[PDB]
Amino acid sequence: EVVKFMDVYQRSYCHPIETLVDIFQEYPDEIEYIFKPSCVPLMRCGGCCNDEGLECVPTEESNITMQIMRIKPHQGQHIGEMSFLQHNKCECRPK
C-alpha cells in the first residue's frame, strides 16, 4: 500500500528521467515537414535535490538517433533518422 520513505526519496532524487519532448522544441527551425510521432521519449535530468542551494543538472550528455516519419502534406511520407540530445548523468550542483 504505502511507498516507504527510502523508496520515495531515492526515486525522486535528481537523475535522468524518461521525458516526452515535442520534436519542434528540439528542431524549431523545421518549416517543411510534419513529424510522426510528434514527440519523442528522451532521458533528461529532473527530480529534486532537497537543497535550495543546489540544482539538478546534467554532467554527461550524448545523442540518441531515432527513426522518425517526416510527412510532406499530400506529397509523401518517409522514415528518416534524427538525433536528439539525452542526459546520461545528472548531479546536484551549486546554483
Ligand X SMILES: *[C@@H]1O[C@H](CO[C@@H]2O[C@@H](C)[C@@H](O)[C@@H](O)[C@@H]2O)[C@@H](O[C@@H]2O[C@H](CO)[C@@H](O[C@@H]3O[C@H](CO[C@H]4O[C@H](CO)[C@@H](O)[C@H](O)[C@@H]4O)[C@@H](O)[C@H](O[C@H]4O[C@H](CO)[C@@H](O)[C@H](O)[C@@H]4O)[C@@H]3O)[C@H](O)[C@H]2NC(C)=O)[C@H](O)[C@H]1NC(C)=O
Cβ proximity of 16 and 56 under 8 Å: no
Q: Which grid coordinates belong to 13?
A: 532524487
Q: Is 26 in the site for ligand X (CB under 6 A)?
A: no
Q: Is 69 in the site for its own copies (CB under 8 A)?
A: yes
Cβ proximity of 54 and 45 under 8 Å: no
Considering only 24-32, 66-74, 87-95, which stretch makes contact with its own copies by CB under 8 A?
Answer: 66-74
Q: Which is nearer to its own copies, 5 or 31 (CB)?
A: 5
Minimum gap (Å) between residue 60 Cβ and its own copies: 18
Q: Which of 36, 72, 89, 95 binds its own copies (CB under 8 A)?
A: 36
Q: Is 88 in the site for ligand X (CB under 6 A)?
A: no
User: Max CA-CA distance within the chain?
Assistant: 55
